[PDB]
Design a binder for this molecule. Sequence first.
Ligand SMILES: *[C@@H]1O[C@@H](C)[C@@H](O)[C@@H](O[C@@H]2O[C@H](CO)[C@@H](O)[C@H](O)[C@H]2NC(C)=O)[C@@H]1O
Ligand SMILES: [Ca+2]
Ligand SMILES: [Ca+2]
Ligand SMILES: [Ca+2]
Ligand SMILES: [Ca+2]
Length: 122
Amino acid sequence: DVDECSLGANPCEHAGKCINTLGSFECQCLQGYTGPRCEIDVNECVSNPCQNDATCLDQIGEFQCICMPGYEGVHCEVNTDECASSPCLHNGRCLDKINEFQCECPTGFTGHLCQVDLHHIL
Ligand SMILES: *[C@@H]1O[C@@H](C)[C@@H](O)[C@@H](O[C@@H]2O[C@H](CO)[C@@H](O)[C@H](O)[C@H]2NC(C)=O)[C@@H]1O
Ligand SMILES: [Ca+2]
Ligand SMILES: [Ca+2]
Ligand SMILES: [Ca+2]
Ligand SMILES: [Ca+2]
């Protein structure tokens, strides 16, 4: 038997661990690498995991998503609820939009956040 792991170069790419066998050898790849000699950098973005026009970053053994405004989550799958912080004053009804909200103000109030009092005028 030749020990392929004790020759001039590591036959395993991308710093994989070479393990000798009788008649051959095997490679124990680092996370994110595949192939008999760990030749391939797995594309973690190949199944399109980043949603809603997010940018997928193909990294070593992982992906990361960069979300379009108004989206969040690991897959950018969550439409951020802009009504969460109760931005509408005076019990205004809050409507969630994309990276935005709308306030439906009660009688006598107006403005994006229902700030303006009109009760005194009438
Ligand atoms: C990575 O981050 C994303 C949030 C986007 O800004 C990406 O650019 C945008 O790509 C989408 C499709 O994925 C496209 O709809 C847009 O035209 C494009 N540019 C902008 C400025 O939105 C970015 O690569
Ligand atoms: Ca061998
Ligand atoms: Ca990768
Ligand atoms: Ca929203
Ligand atoms: Ca606004």
